[PDB]
Ligand binder design. Structure first.
Ligand SMILES: Cc1ncc(COP(=O)(O)O)c(/C=C/C(=O)Cc2c[nH]c3ccccc23)c1O
Ligand SMILES: Cc1ncc(COP(=O)(O)O)c(/C=C/C(=O)Cc2c[nH]c3ccccc23)c1O
Ligand SMILES: N[C@](CF)(Cc1c[nH]c2ccccc12)C(=O)O
Ligand SMILES: N[C@](CF)(Cc1c[nH]c2ccccc12)C(=O)O
Lengths: 470, 469
């Protein structure tokens, strides 16, 4: 049809975009991190509607570039310091283009033997970094949330049966990411059987309060089956006592899952790999590549010490898929059946950049946060709530002649101010009952001035609003 | 840097691939559907290792094209007739390139308000086609398996509580896809509380046996909470009695989920949309775009009649994300938090191609299977186990002077023979206790000859192996 793009029309539409984008992204350090959409932009989109007849390709492409993609909080920006930024390598993008082109049906071996071989090679390599030396296994999932649900399902099916599984209790901390408890609820573990253990001043799980909670539930008649330790808390980037938790798990016959969606990448850092000592003691661990392995959304991994545990929870044997089966299929490792070759783009990056460069790029993240801390220390009335920890730091502006409520409002306005300035992206979070500014800097192309000028800009906004409030 | 690509190296590396691929895929109709890898290919890959130092980009690129991507069972091929093929539009590929470029964090509105607005517009439109007219809602998930688990999770939380949910029973058919029961087990529903209802000769769920199972479980003290009807069975492409199932669900206060991962796309076909009458009666429905909406893996949708049910099961309010919030975030309707704008590539395809063309391309799928059946009718000893149904058909070559075991082995060798010929991809399945050849043709650029020549080739292989025995 006159609407279908021919091989020449397609190739030109693609090159047109690839060219225009590379030029635009080349100037990223001099672009506002946040580009606000106007008040009537939502109605502009709602009027386009779904057409019965086709439209000129280059007309639709430009429409998306100008009316959709433009208005965003670019987490690819070197001065995006909020949540967990996505400083994806350009090589990862290349991987997506190649993977999406062939559109090979991954999550199955016979139909793509070398595609599966590539993924397993990376998974074996990652498993080596974790400390799994016997018979590991894994699957490239979409997110760490899916990584957690996958791992926890294997944990549930390993420690519980079809008759007593409603007596299972899980154990987390008050700093554990929300997706863990959300995943537990999905797999049938109600909130009434999820224990939230308090953390110390370093935001690490209190293993003493953990054990007595385990002891209480066991005495009560529950069956404690899993403890979720976190290596790189979302808030402060803290690391739970991995060794201490492992000791308790072996004692009480429980599954040890390490939620390392963020911090697991530190295992590739020669300098800081020691920080994650004891990960090999875990039975399963999550690890997001679109985080600190510089991949595009979404490419996350789940790794188990014993692959048999993943096979037990997710294997199927229908009449179909009989000619597609020793050599495990990814669909038998759960929990999806049709999958794109997510891990291939990670392979491409590892080959083009190398493990050394990626390790150092991660170490740069640590340095960026330390630079932020060094710039805050000398400034008056600036308080460090959590020190520079794993490329992560929390702080607030707190003049003493203000009440706590006012201090919260103050730091909120400071975040608001620097956001509209367009120089950096910094949002607020809550820590120890106080509204706090948070910085997570992991972009390899971010410099000392970037961190220094940001704090300098924040300090200016701070003392400015402080006077305005009086 | 030395291993870091600059804007000129990047743009050149991409265009080089885009150029070489388009040329190669332009000649796809004259390429073997399956390209087998040699015995030494696995060790060749294992020897590459993970390097500490970087490598030249185009050297790595060419290595993957020649040693990885090449050896595959191309489901993009117009003569890939196995399972559920993936005849993805080139526009969809373009969508992935744009989406992956900006790398915008979707699954959240405040950080990408117009990206989310686009997805909701597509979801609302799809909801209109399904029959949800009140206050629908949905999410672009990775797969239809994730579509089912998302929907079934909402069903569980809607009909059960934290105190009685271990008494819940679910009901499927013997033709229901494996991912449904697999999803049920994941959300805590054990096999001992999953009922598999027999199907008729048309592979449709026996609603009479369905009700008697519900009555039995309810009388025993169980709590029947969901029935999963399928619109487009994976095997034969049959459609469960949606109306009959809905009546029972309303009668027994149960959640009605329609698994339309494949067949839901038929709603876009003016000719065949009537086949899916009653989809609006469901409480939830799955729908995969990387199947019959011609998208790349992976782009699937889950739609619920009442969006409040999705919010109840997946909403979270942690300390962080407080500056990110009514206007629901996609993470509040589960079950993932970080997401790529999966739905954007579906938007691009709908705008560039239009809903009319896509509807016709689906109708072409119906025609391809009919052409396959028409070519089989005159051929001797060729048996139709399931007629051409929704671009899907099951058949076997069965000479009468053969045993039941021999007939199975025969059709297996026939599949094996045509696979290695490279002309087409056809695998076997089991149906009514018989090994059967299956064809699913949904590629818009597949012709009458393709189906005719394929059947002609199968008959040849059939009459040759029959002679060997
Ligand atoms: C009703 C029905 N429901 C759910 C699913 C699962 O969806 P995902 O596969 O998206 O999770 C299906 C899927 C059926 C298939 O079979 C798809 C398929 C295409 N190429 C393959 C290659 C190998 C195995 C399976 C496939 C299906 O047919
Ligand atoms: C330990 C830990 N475990 C799991 C996750 C799961 O995240 P995904 O499910 O998204 O993989 C996380 C992630 C925490 C985040 O912080 C998510 C996030 C990244 N960028 C964002 C932008 C807006 C809102 C949220 C995010 C995490 O920090
Ligand atoms: N690859 C660059 C080119 F500068 C920078 C970059 C983003 N993530 C990275 C991770 C490691 C090394 C470099 C990077 C890009 O912006 O695409
Ligand atoms: N778009 C074509 C053109 F050649 C064919 C195609 C694949 N899925 C489709 C869905 C609708 C219309 C055409 C197609 C391609 O090969 O990419």
């Amino acid at each position: 049809t006159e609407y279908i793009l021919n091989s020449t029309q397609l190739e030109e539409a693609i090159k047109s975009f690839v060219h225009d984008f590379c030029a635009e992204k080349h100037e990223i350090h001099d672009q506002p991190v946040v580009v606000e959409a106007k008040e009537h932009q939502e109605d502009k989109i709602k009027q386009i509607k779904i057409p019965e007849k086709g439209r000129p390709v280059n007309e639709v492409v430009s429409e998306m570039m100008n009316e959709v993609y433009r208005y965003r909080g670019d987490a690819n920006h070197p001065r995006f310091f909020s949540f967990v930024p996505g400083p994806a390598s350009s090589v990862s993008w290349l991987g997506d283009i190649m993977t999406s082109a062939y559109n090979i049906h991954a999550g199955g071996s016979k139909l793509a033997p070398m595609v599966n071989c590539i993924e397993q090679e990376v998974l074996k390599w990652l498993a080596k970094q974790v400390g799994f030396t016997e018979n590991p296994g894994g699957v490239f999932v979409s997110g760490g949330s899916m990584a957690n649900i996958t791992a926890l399902t294997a944990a549930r099916d390993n420690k519980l049966t079809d008759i007593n599984l409603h007596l299972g209790t899980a154990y987390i901390s008050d700093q554990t990411h929300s997706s863990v408890a959300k995943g537990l609820r999905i797999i049938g573990i109600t909130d009434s059987r999820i224990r939230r253990i308090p953390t110390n001043s370093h935001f690490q799980m209190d293993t003493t309060k953990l054990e007595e909670a385990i002891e209480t539930d066991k005495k009560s008649g529950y069956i404690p089956f899993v403890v979720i330790g976190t290596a790189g808390t979302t808030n402060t980037g803290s690391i739970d006592p991995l060794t201490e938790i492992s000791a308790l798990c072996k004692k009480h016959d429980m599954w040890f899952h390490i939620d390392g969606a963020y911090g697991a990448s530190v295992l590739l850092s020669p300098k800081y790999k020691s920080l994650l000592t004891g990960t090999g003691l875990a039975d399963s661990i999550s690890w997001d590549a679109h985080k600190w392995l510089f991949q595009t959304y979404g490419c996350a991994m789940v790794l188990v010490k014993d692959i048999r545990n993943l096979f037990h929870s997710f294997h199927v044997n229908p009449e179909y898929l009989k000619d597609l089966e020793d050599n495990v299929n990814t669909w038998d490792i759960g929990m999806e059946l049709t999958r794109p070759a997510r891990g291939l783009k990670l392979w491409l990056t590892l080959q083009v950049l190398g493990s050394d460069l990626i390790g150092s790029a991660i170490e740069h993240g640590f340095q960026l946060a330390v630079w932020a801390e060094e710039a805050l220390n000398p400034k008056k009335d600036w308080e460090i709530v959590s020190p520079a920890q794993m490329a992560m730091i929390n702080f607030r502006y707190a003049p003493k002649d203000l009440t706590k409520e006012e201090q919260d409002i103050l730091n909120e306005k400071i975040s608001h101010r620097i956001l509209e300035s367009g120089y950096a992206a910094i949002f607020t979070t809550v820590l120890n009952g106080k509204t706090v500014l948070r910085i997570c800097a992991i972009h390899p192309e971010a410099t000392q001035e970037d961190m220094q000028h940001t704090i300098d800009l924040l300090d200016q906004y701070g003392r400015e609003i402080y006077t305005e409030m009086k």
